[PDB]
């Protein structure tokens, strides 16, 4: 790797600078280098890794959606043949998106997940695994589409099982996992009722636990609870 010669601490420092400069591709490359040093990541470092790749893939997904919409309109009746260019360029963006997802999944499988024993690390990484399979599922159309969807489901489900046993209902990672798995149900698995039930039960169980929290923890938990409520409002 091109980051193999840079100190771990320097990679982390530069990831933080890249975040300040909104240079998310750089941030992701620095964090990939840090992961590849082979040591486990701290809570803050896991956040740097996830923020970097979430921003990179989020931009790719937004671009893919723009191009896919143009492509769909081009294939409507009465539209003029514009040639292969829209499909080609959508495919180019799609292939780059798949490459980034494969890279993240590769870091998780070699070897972040297998060395993650605490709930706060293991749930976070398994949630990421579900997220990146979900992004692959958003663009999938081939023989393996059902297996891609099931890979996302399986990762989210393992994260859910651990989170319910090992974290309080207000834990922000537990809440964010539930938020995203609920979106998986709604958008990917054609299961809007499961999506709504999960978001509602998660919200209600968190509400009942807020009384145990400090002011700062309350702010953290209610932030994610509001996202669950926002999705429920969208879906009902």
């Amino acid at each position: 790797g091109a980051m193999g010669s840079m100190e771990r601490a320097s990679l982390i420092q530069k990831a933080k600078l890249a975040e300040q400069a909104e240079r998310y591709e750089d941030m992701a490359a620095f964090m990939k280098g840090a992961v590849e040093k082979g040591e486990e990541l701290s809570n803050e470092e896991r956040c740097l890794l996830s923020v970097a790749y979430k921003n990179v893939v989020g931009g790719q997904r937004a671009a893919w959606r723009v191009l896919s919409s143009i492509e769909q309109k081009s294939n409507e009746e009465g539209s003029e043949e514009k040639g292969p260019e829209v499909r080609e360029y959508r495919e180019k963006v799609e292939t780059e998106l798949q490459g980034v997802c494969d890279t993240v999944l590769g870091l998780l499988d070699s070897h972040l997940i297998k060395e993650a024993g605490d709930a706060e690390s293991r749930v976070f990484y398994l949630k990421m695994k579900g997220d990146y399979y979900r992004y692959l599922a958003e663009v999938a159309t081939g023989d393996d589409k059902k297996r891609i969807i099931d890979s996302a489901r399986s990762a989210y489900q393992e994260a859910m099982d651990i989170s319910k046993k090992e974290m309080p209902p207000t834990n922000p990672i537990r809440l964010g996992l539930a938020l995203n798995f609920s979106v998986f149900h709604y958008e990917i698995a054609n299961s809007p009722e499961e999506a709504i039930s999960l978001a509602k039960t998660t919200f209600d169980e968190a509400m009942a636990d807020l009384h145990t929290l400090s002011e700062d923890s309350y702010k953290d938990s209610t932030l994610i609870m509001q996202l669950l409520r926002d999705n429920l409002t969208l879906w009902t």
Binding site: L179, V183, Y186, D230, N231, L234
Partner: peptide, 5 residues
């Protein structure tokens, strides 16, 4: 799109 984190 719905919210994810």
């Amino acid at each position: 799109f719905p919210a994810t984190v």
